[PDB]
Design a protein around this motif. Sequence first.
Motif, PDB file in Angstrom:
ATOM      1  N   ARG A   1      24.338  -0.764  -2.910  1.00  0.00           N
ATOM      2  CA  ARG A   1      23.349  -1.126  -3.908  1.00  0.00           C
ATOM      3  C   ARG A   1      22.392  -2.103  -3.196  1.00  0.00           C
ATOM      4  O   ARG A   1      22.726  -2.647  -2.121  1.00  0.00           O
ATOM      5  CB  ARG A   1      24.031  -1.811  -5.087  1.00  0.00           C
ATOM      6  N   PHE A   2      21.222  -2.349  -3.783  1.00  0.00           N
ATOM      7  CA  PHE A   2      20.242  -3.242  -3.156  1.00  0.00           C
ATOM      8  C   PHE A   2      19.635  -4.308  -4.060  1.00  0.00           C
ATOM      9  O   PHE A   2      19.127  -3.953  -5.111  1.00  0.00           O
ATOM     10  CB  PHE A   2      19.048  -2.412  -2.627  1.00  0.00           C
ATOM     11  N   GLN A   3      19.654  -5.597  -3.693  1.00  0.00           N
ATOM     12  CA  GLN A   3      18.909  -6.521  -4.561  1.00  0.00           C
ATOM     13  C   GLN A   3      17.457  -6.020  -4.544  1.00  0.00           C
ATOM     14  O   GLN A   3      17.004  -5.365  -3.586  1.00  0.00           O
ATOM     15  CB  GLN A   3      18.883  -7.956  -4.069  1.00  0.00           C
TER      16      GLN A   3
ATOM     17  N   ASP B   1      27.785   4.231  -0.876  1.00  0.00           N
ATOM     18  CA  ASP B   1      27.863   3.506  -2.153  1.00  0.00           C
ATOM     19  C   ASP B   1      27.232   2.129  -2.034  1.00  0.00           C
ATOM     20  O   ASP B   1      27.795   1.116  -2.473  1.00  0.00           O
ATOM     21  CB  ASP B   1      29.334   3.410  -2.669  1.00  0.00           C
TER      22      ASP B   1
ATOM     23  N   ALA C   1      18.440  -9.844  -0.054  1.00  0.00           N
ATOM     24  CA  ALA C   1      17.210 -10.271   0.592  1.00  0.00           C
ATOM     25  C   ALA C   1      17.547 -11.068   1.874  1.00  0.00           C
ATOM     26  O   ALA C   1      16.896 -10.866   2.891  1.00  0.00           O
ATOM     27  CB  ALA C   1      16.394 -11.146  -0.355  1.00  0.00           C
TER      28      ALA C   1
ATOM     29  N   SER D   1      14.823  -7.956  -4.533  1.00  0.00           N
ATOM     30  CA  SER D   1      14.089  -8.751  -3.556  1.00  0.00           C
ATOM     31  C   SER D   1      14.309  -8.236  -2.119  1.00  0.00           C
ATOM     32  O   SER D   1      13.440  -8.427  -1.285  1.00  0.00           O
ATOM     33  CB  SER D   1      14.453 -10.230  -3.661  1.00  0.00           C
ATOM     34  N   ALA D   2      15.450  -7.570  -1.851  1.00  0.00           N
ATOM     35  CA  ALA D   2      15.754  -7.003  -0.548  1.00  0.00           C
ATOM     36  C   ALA D   2      14.860  -5.821  -0.238  1.00  0.00           C
ATOM     37  O   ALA D   2      14.339  -5.739   0.883  1.00  0.00           O
ATOM     38  CB  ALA D   2      17.200  -6.557  -0.440  1.00  0.00           C
TER      39      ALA D   2
ATOM     40  N   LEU E   1       0.769  -1.187   0.000  1.00  0.00           N
ATOM     41  CA  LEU E   1       0.000   0.000   0.000  1.00  0.00           C
ATOM     42  C   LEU E   1       0.820   1.266   0.000  1.00  0.00           C
ATOM     43  O   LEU E   1       0.268   2.354  -0.181  1.00  0.00           O
ATOM     44  CB  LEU E   1      -0.971  -0.023   1.181  1.00  0.00           C
ATOM     45  N   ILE E   2       2.119   1.156   0.212  1.00  0.00           N
ATOM     46  CA  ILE E   2       2.927   2.360   0.164  1.00  0.00           C
ATOM     47  C   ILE E   2       3.428   2.375  -1.281  1.00  0.00           C
ATOM     48  O   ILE E   2       3.783   1.317  -1.800  1.00  0.00           O
ATOM     49  CB  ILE E   2       4.129   2.279   1.139  1.00  0.00           C
ATOM     50  N   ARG E   3       3.450   3.516  -1.965  1.00  0.00           N
ATOM     51  CA  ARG E   3       3.954   3.489  -3.362  1.00  0.00           C
ATOM     52  C   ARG E   3       5.423   3.076  -3.348  1.00  0.00           C
ATOM     53  O   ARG E   3       6.167   3.470  -2.443  1.00  0.00           O
ATOM     54  CB  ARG E   3       3.812   4.849  -4.019  1.00  0.00           C
TER      55      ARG E   3
ATOM     56  N   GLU F   1       7.517  -5.464   2.611  1.00  0.00           N
ATOM     57  CA  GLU F   1       6.570  -6.417   3.177  1.00  0.00           C
ATOM     58  C   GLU F   1       6.653  -6.417   4.717  1.00  0.00           C
ATOM     59  O   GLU F   1       5.621  -6.423   5.373  1.00  0.00           O
ATOM     60  CB  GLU F   1       6.879  -7.815   2.717  1.00  0.00           C
TER      61      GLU F   1
ATOM     62  N   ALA G   1      -1.205   6.894   1.699  1.00  0.00           N
ATOM     63  CA  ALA G   1      -0.663   5.552   1.927  1.00  0.00           C
ATOM     64  C   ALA G   1      -0.854   5.178   3.413  1.00  0.00           C
ATOM     65  O   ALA G   1      -1.256   4.041   3.744  1.00  0.00           O
ATOM     66  CB  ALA G   1       0.794   5.483   1.548  1.00  0.00           C
TER      67      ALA G   1
ATOM     68  N   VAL H   1      23.155  -4.983  -0.477  1.00  0.00           N
ATOM     69  CA  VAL H   1      22.327  -5.560   0.597  1.00  0.00           C
ATOM     70  C   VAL H   1      21.439  -6.612  -0.096  1.00  0.00           C
ATOM     71  O   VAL H   1      20.745  -6.291  -1.080  1.00  0.00           O
ATOM     72  CB  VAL H   1      21.426  -4.496   1.211  1.00  0.00           C
TER      73      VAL H   1
ATOM     74  N   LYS I   1      28.649  -5.128  -1.339  1.00  0.00           N
ATOM     75  CA  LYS I   1      28.233  -3.732  -1.388  1.00  0.00           C
ATOM     76  C   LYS I   1      26.783  -3.721  -1.769  1.00  0.00           C
ATOM     77  O   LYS I   1      26.194  -2.669  -2.027  1.00  0.00           O
ATOM     78  CB  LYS I   1      29.008  -2.984  -2.468  1.00  0.00           C
TER      79      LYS I   1
ATOM     80  N   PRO J   1       8.983   5.818  -3.677  1.00  0.00           N
ATOM     81  CA  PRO J   1       9.120   6.620  -2.461  1.00  0.00           C
ATOM     82  C   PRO J   1       9.701   5.765  -1.309  1.00  0.00           C
ATOM     83  O   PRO J   1      10.566   6.205  -0.566  1.00  0.00           O
ATOM     84  CB  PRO J   1       7.687   7.055  -2.172  1.00  0.00           C
TER      85      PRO J   1
END
Lengths: 103, 100, 86, 80, 95, 95, 59, 103
Positions: free
Chosen positions: B48-50, B46, D61, B52-53, B26-28, B59, D11, D59, D57, B31
């Motif tokens: 980065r993020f998967q 510096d 799941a 799925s993370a 429910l949160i866009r 969730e 939201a 993050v 570097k 953002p």
Amino acid sequence: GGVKKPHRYRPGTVALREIRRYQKSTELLIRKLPFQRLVREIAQDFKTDLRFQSSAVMALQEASEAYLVALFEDTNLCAIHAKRVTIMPKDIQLARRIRGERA
Amino acid sequence: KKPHRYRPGTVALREIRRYQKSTELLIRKLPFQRLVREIAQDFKTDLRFQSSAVMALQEASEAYLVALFEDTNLCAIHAKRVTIMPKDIQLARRIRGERA
Amino acid sequence: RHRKVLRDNIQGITKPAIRRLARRGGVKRISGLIYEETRGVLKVFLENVIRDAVTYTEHAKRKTVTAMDVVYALKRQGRTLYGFGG
Amino acid sequence: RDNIQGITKPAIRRLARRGGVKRISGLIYEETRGVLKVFLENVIRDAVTYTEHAKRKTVTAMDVVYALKRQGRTLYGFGG
Amino acid sequence: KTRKESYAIYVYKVLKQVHPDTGISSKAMSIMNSFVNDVFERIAGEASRLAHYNKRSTITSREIQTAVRLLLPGELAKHAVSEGTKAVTKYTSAK
Amino acid sequence: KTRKESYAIYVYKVLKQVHPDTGISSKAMSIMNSFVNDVFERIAGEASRLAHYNKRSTITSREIQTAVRLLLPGELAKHAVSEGTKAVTKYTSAK
Amino acid sequence: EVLELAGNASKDLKVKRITPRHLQLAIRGDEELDSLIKATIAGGGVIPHIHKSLIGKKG
Amino acid sequence: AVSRSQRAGLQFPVGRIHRHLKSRTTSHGRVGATAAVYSAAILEYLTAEVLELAGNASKDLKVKRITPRHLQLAIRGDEELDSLIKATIAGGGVIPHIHKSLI
DNA sequence: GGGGGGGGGGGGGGGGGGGGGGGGGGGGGGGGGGGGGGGGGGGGGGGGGGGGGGGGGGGGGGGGGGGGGGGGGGGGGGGGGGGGGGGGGGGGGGGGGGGGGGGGGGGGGGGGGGGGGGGGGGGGGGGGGGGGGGGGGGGGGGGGGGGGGGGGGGGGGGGGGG
DNA sequence: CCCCCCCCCCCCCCCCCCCCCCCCCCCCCCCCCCCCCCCCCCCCCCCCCCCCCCCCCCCCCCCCCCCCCCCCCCCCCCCCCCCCCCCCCCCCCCCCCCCCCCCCCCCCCCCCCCCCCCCCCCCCCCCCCCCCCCCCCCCCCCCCCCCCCCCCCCCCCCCCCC
């Protein structure tokens, strides 16, 4: 009057006096033998013929009073949130629903 | 012209039904992704993020805030109101042991 | 070679003891129904703890519930205790 | 426009509805934001600590899943 | 590319005996796999704590059993134990 | 056998360094003994998993450090990490 | 045990595949599983429910 | 012969801590040379922090021995120690406090 | 009660992302049989701790009564979200370069294994001695019985003049 | 218009009446028991020192996938009108706290015997290890099928307003 009105503290005054007193001490507040029988009785209804190291019983008493006292602080927050100074069964129930317990 | 207005509280009940029926987030997304990255930047640069993370974080957060709104509502109702207020969120976090 | 039947020992948690516990917990005024509610809540709490403690005791094939049994049972339920073990 | 304000009234209002909430005070929006910021700080801090330890570097799941579990907020559906 | 073990095919087999004509979505299978991993971890963990409390080195079916009694709520435990004794028996008696 | 390990002589040493004229009751020492065991079980635990998640079998000072950053609150972590670092560096300076 | 309840939850919806929502329905709906499974089920939502005092118009 | 503790400049037992790590190992598990050293330092440091504060409290009460009550005032009194130590401290009672609306 | 306008439901339908069915592989599990080693169960054995039984006495508990207090209910008011209609710049989906996330394959400090060895905690047991808590003995308070104006200090009209 | 000087009017803010018998409370004091405190060995236990593996790091190689962008799409914020809702006040009865009285059950002190449990010692069923054989599950690639889910149409029911 003659020996005039025998002195009487107003409702609440002795109660505050009591909170100051018990809050600064550390002794067990439930009598020992009756709490030991309650333990033996509940244990027995699970398995007959059990014995108890006396320190096992002391551990359950410390745990129990620590659990009740913390539950009365939460119950007291629910009463005050409701603008009362009197704790009620519904305050205890609210505290346990939020704590995630039940019974 | 067309004068039709629902009574305060009728659309609100319709929303509760619609949203408890569904499971989407429910949160866009963007953002929320931005918020996550900014909070992380103070712990390490510096980064980065998967994908799925970021999703797992969203969730977990939404399940947390929704469950916090359920306890909050219980506190408002305990005080005989139907409107949640900051003191209800506070009472609820205080009892949960989260304190803040 | 004898007896004694344990019954209704929950009434051994008396109204004065419950009031003392509430005072330590900062409570100023107590409604009349709080006492039977507190007893019910204590019974459940002890049942859950005694149930786990006795399970460790039996597992170890002992007949004596030890302070350690209580301490591990309190720990499993997230209620760690310091002063006997933990 | 600050990022935390990207979490908008609408939201926040939808989360409350799923939470069965009927009427919302106006001050609730800022409070919810502070609460979410704290929740996210506690979890990201633990996720990033797992990342650095693994010398990455990115993050992952799993770093988030192990962070949530550590905090008693176990999540199913993303590995682990 | 290194192999990630999963419980998915075994979850699917159990699914088939239970609702032979039902399927299961990917996201749902991922949840079941997390559930199975979580329960095995809580169980092996309690069982080895049991072993350690008793100054023993072997995790036997008896520890797995007490661990189930400590982890599962009444009925679930009743049947689970029952399912456990039943597999061991059928396995003990074999070639 | 019968001899049970305790941390009490070590807690006494530390108490003498911070409060030379202060004693500790046996009840209090019992609590400190549980506290220390508890913290150690928690750190070793986090270090193990940490190692596990990374497909490593060795628990080094690096796992212990991360375990410590995960377990202690902000400021306690910094001071503990710096005391951990200091003792490793000194230890290895002799070998 | 979970597939059996999740499986019923999906049949009573006249659908063939068990989803996260079905798993959430089955778990929060059974006292013993609810108690045993505290994890958040991604994509499951909540059980529908409106407090009696919010439902209203009263009379 | 210098002990590993002495070699590390610590009061907490490195050899023993090393031993305990090797037995909570996990099969083919290995314990590095310096893991026990770092562990003994964290343990000795936390212990030092708790005694420093308990000792201050036994002192503001004109008394020589630290009691569970002093350990409890020290721990509930410090935001971080309070957060880290959730255990129940037998015999420690609680921190005195009365809600303003009850007075 | 009726209309008036909506939402909602039910059944039906269609495309497409998701799911599945297939073949193929191969390093890695899985299982086997045989050998050797090890955890542990029994079986005393001895010691330690737990109910149990006894007796004496005072604090704890219970019951009762009375009054003050506090909770509940009702009403009213001003005020604050809900709902509505309106407007619009970012977000969402798709596509594409680039950069770490794995994957691999060694080699070397580092860690274990084995053997020996010298300290190192660890009970046990009197034994002396030493903080501590309780008891006593005065001493300086916060409120129960309310109290009684008496001031500054806004506050809100109120009204009248400017 | 507007503003300014009245004009009560609480109102809060000390203030000035008297506590006053508990309520701590704080200092003192003194037995007392437990807490050390040496002794007393002593099994433990942690250190060393070769001797022999070995796992992890690290550079290199690989290569899905993360960020970024553009094009396309959508949720948000809004000011406004309305009405209910939260709050506040008042009223009233019931309930619970304070106090008194009498009682007794919990506590304290002793011992004591018997259970039972731990510790050791003996023995041996059981697990591991190993090598060999084998099967084999996750992955890749593939690639036909399909359950779903949004959409549509038509109808029914509900809500709001009149």
